[PDB]
Amino acid sequence: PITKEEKQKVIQEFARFPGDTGSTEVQVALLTLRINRLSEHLKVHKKDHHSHRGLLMMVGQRRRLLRYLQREDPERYRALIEKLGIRG
Amino acid sequence: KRQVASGRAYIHASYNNTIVTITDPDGNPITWSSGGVIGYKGSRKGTPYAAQLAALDAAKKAMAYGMQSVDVIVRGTGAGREQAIRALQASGLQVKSIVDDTPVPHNGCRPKKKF
Amino acid sequence: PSRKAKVKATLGEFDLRDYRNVEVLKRFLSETGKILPRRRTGLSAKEQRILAKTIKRARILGLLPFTEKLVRK
RNA sequence: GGUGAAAUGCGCAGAUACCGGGAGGAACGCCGAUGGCGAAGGCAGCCACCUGGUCCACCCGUGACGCUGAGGCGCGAAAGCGUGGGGAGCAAACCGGAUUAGAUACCCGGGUAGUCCACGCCCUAAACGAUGCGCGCUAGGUCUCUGGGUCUCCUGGGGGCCGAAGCUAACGCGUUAAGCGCGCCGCCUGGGGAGUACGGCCGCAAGGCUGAAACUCAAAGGAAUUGACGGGGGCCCGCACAAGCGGUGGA
Ligand SMILES: [Mg+2]
Ligand SMILES: [Mg+2]
Ligand SMILES: [Mg+2]
Ligand SMILES: [Mg+2]
Ligand SMILES: [Mg+2]
Ligand SMILES: [Mg+2]
Ligand SMILES: [Mg+2]
Ligand SMILES: [Mg+2]
Ligand SMILES: [Mg+2]
Ligand SMILES: [Mg+2]
Ligand SMILES: [Mg+2]
Ligand SMILES: [Mg+2]
Ligand SMILES: [Mg+2]
Ligand SMILES: [Mg+2]
Ligand SMILES: [Mg+2]
Ligand SMILES: [Mg+2]
Ligand SMILES: [Mg+2]
Ligand SMILES: [Mg+2]
């Protein structure tokens, strides 16, 4: 799955100051990581529809924090959507 | 034929019948008998007085080979199940140990309609 | 009343996950290999959901029997 | 063997019962609980692995980012189709035997589909708490699963039963609301005709979705009450039956 230290990575590699356990960006990330161990886990286990759920409540949950950032600051967005390289 | 001291008693109690095959400490069919061999023809066969009877005519073919001791085994819950068990303590045969070992799935085969 | 004695008091302490503790885990079966009904054992809501996947372990490793036959006793 | 009783059926090419070995398929006994989890269909033998949801604690972080959703997208038991495997046991259709006035059934002995795996379809249901989805407020009592604490008790999240206030046609609901209010959704508008027809839409097909009218009837309904009634039960009595005596029916 994931452990603390790989998490740690994405956290501090992203936080807008040190101990920002969660800003917006942090979370837009953490999911990105989780979605992605999930895209795979599914990309072979095609018959696990059950977890496909959790994926989408996550595909989802991201897309709001997305817009939230599009609204309260569009630069810190431009920077968060290159730094993870999404849309598509 | 041969002679055998210790031998073991198998009892199979259904509903339409009750069957006693008696054997030797391996499990080899010395003499066997059920109610339908006693003279009973249809639903007659399952009576507790038929089970008492098979465990006579089977235990009588078995003293014919000089039977001394028995251990008993029983397969089922059926009409006169223990009526044969008693019918053996009552025939003139040391009843060693008495054991039940009924076929008990751990849920494999879907039984017929008639559950 | 089935008021003999449950097996929770008839022992010092032990672990419910040590599969091969077969001195103890023999007194959690019957005169069949059947895992004793929770009323006989007197185990918690957790406890006999643990002792469940225990004697299902210590069975495959032969130690504890799947079933027996029966002593008329 | 089978049944109310029996025959079709299997056995003197050796059946059943009985011991030892072997293959193969399908499910998972006891723990199994009024118990758990999940959005729903749904899920329990055991092991590991890849994962989803979720609760508790400390209140550390950003700082209203939140709710609901027409259409679109995905999941959706069972049967059903399609190509290919698999087929023990069960078992529509079907083959017989029995019952009955007749039995295309209830009962019995075989039997293909199929249930099983795959991969794509099918996309319905008494899919049911027949209660769409979030938040705020309103006596409590016991029970039960699961968390945290100074664990005689306190306090979170669940599943049940009884009850305040209040609602309700009544039943019953009852801090798991059918109580008191806010948001949004979909849905109803008298019974039959009818889940049909017309049209479009989806599928290979079986069919589904959306979904009327003409005409005809004064109803169709919902809970609830007193009875009557049951091849429903519980409890009493009469020469009602049995235990006994004597007759008719025949002359
Ligand atoms: Mg064998
Ligand atoms: Mg259900
Ligand atoms: Mg804080
Ligand atoms: Mg601040
Ligand atoms: Mg929504
Ligand atoms: Mg199916
Ligand atoms: Mg095939
Ligand atoms: Mg049949
Ligand atoms: Mg098929
Ligand atoms: Mg399939
Ligand atoms: Mg389907
Ligand atoms: Mg329909
Ligand atoms: Mg619903
Ligand atoms: Mg509660
Ligand atoms: Mg009241
Ligand atoms: Mg109540
Ligand atoms: Mg009308
Ligand atoms: Mg009389």
From Swiss-Prot, chain A:
Database matches in SMART domains: Ribosomal_S15
Gene Ontology CC annotations of this record: cytosolic small ribosomal subunit
Gene Ontology molecular function: rRNA binding; structural constituent of ribosome
SUPFAM superfamilies in alphabetical order: S15/NS1 RNA-binding domain (SSF47060)
Protein's UniProt keywords contain Lipoprotein: no
Keywords annotated in UniProt: Ribonucleoprotein, Ribosomal protein, RNA-binding, rRNA-binding
GO annotation terms (biological process): translation
InterPro entries: Ribosomal_uS15, Ribosomal_uS15_bac-type, uS15_NS1_RNA-bd_sf
Keyword Transit peptide attributed: no
Pfam entry (one): Ribosomal_S15
Function: One of the primary rRNA binding proteins, it binds directly to 16S rRNA where it helps nucleate assembly of the platform of the 30S subunit by binding and bridging several RNA helices of the 16S rRNA.
Description of how the protein assembles with itself and partners: Part of the 30S ribosomal subunit. Forms a bridge to the 50S subunit in the 70S ribosome, contacting the 23S rRNA.
HAMAP family assigned: Ribosomal_uS15_B
PANTHER family listed in its UniProt record: RIBOSOMAL PROTEIN S15, BACTERIAL AND ORGANELLAR, SMALL RIBOSOMAL SUBUNIT PROTEIN US15M
Family classification: Belongs to the universal ribosomal protein uS15 family.
Annotated protein name in UniProt: Small ribosomal subunit protein uS15
Upper lineage: Bacteria, Thermotogati, Deinococcota, Deinococci, Thermales
UniProtKB/Swiss-Prot annotation, chain B:
Record's GO cellular component terms: ribonucleoprotein complex; ribosome
Domain of life (superkingdom): Bacteria
Keywords: Ribonucleoprotein, Ribosomal protein, RNA-binding, rRNA-binding
Gene Ontology BP annotations: translation
Region ranges (Disordered): 99-115
InterPro entries in the record: Ribosomal_uS11 (IPR001971), Ribosomal_uS11_bac-type (IPR019981), Ribosomal_uS11_CS (IPR018102), Ribosomal_uS11_sf (IPR036967)
GO molecular function, one term: structural constituent of ribosome
Biased composition (Basic residues): 109-115
Family assignment from sequence similarity: Belongs to the universal ribosomal protein uS11 family.
Subunit structure: Part of the 30S ribosomal subunit. Interacts with proteins S7 and S18. Binds to the C-terminus of IF-3; however exactly how IF-3 interacts with the 30S subunit is unclear. May contact the C-terminus of Era.
Chain's role: Located on the upper part of the platform of the 30S subunit, where it bridges several disparate RNA helices of the 16S rRNA. Forms part of the Shine-Dalgarno cleft in the 70S ribosome, where it interacts both with the Shine-Dalgarno helix and mRNA.
UniProt name for this protein: Small ribosomal subunit protein uS11
Native source organism of the sequence: Thermus thermophilus (strain ATCC 27634 / DSM 579 / HB8)
Swiss-Prot record, chain C:
Lineage: Bacteria, Thermotogati, Deinococcota, Deinococci, Thermales
UniProt subunit comment: Part of the 30S ribosomal subunit. Forms a tight heterodimer with protein bS6, also interacts with protein uS11. Binds to the C-terminus of IF3 and to the central section of Era.
Name of the protein this chain belongs to: Small ribosomal subunit protein bS18
One Gene Ontology term, aspect cellular component: ribosome
Function: Located on the back of the platform of the 30S subunit where it stabilizes the close packing of several RNA helices of the 16S rRNA. Forms part of the Shine-Dalgarno cleft in the 70S ribosome, where it probably interacts with the Shine-Dalgarno helix.
Example GO molecular function: small ribosomal subunit rRNA binding
Gene: rpsR
Portion of the full-length sequence here: 16 to 88 of 88
UniProt organism field: Thermus thermophilus (strain ATCC 27634 / DSM 579 / HB8)
Family note: Belongs to the bacterial ribosomal protein bS18 family.
Coiled coil: none
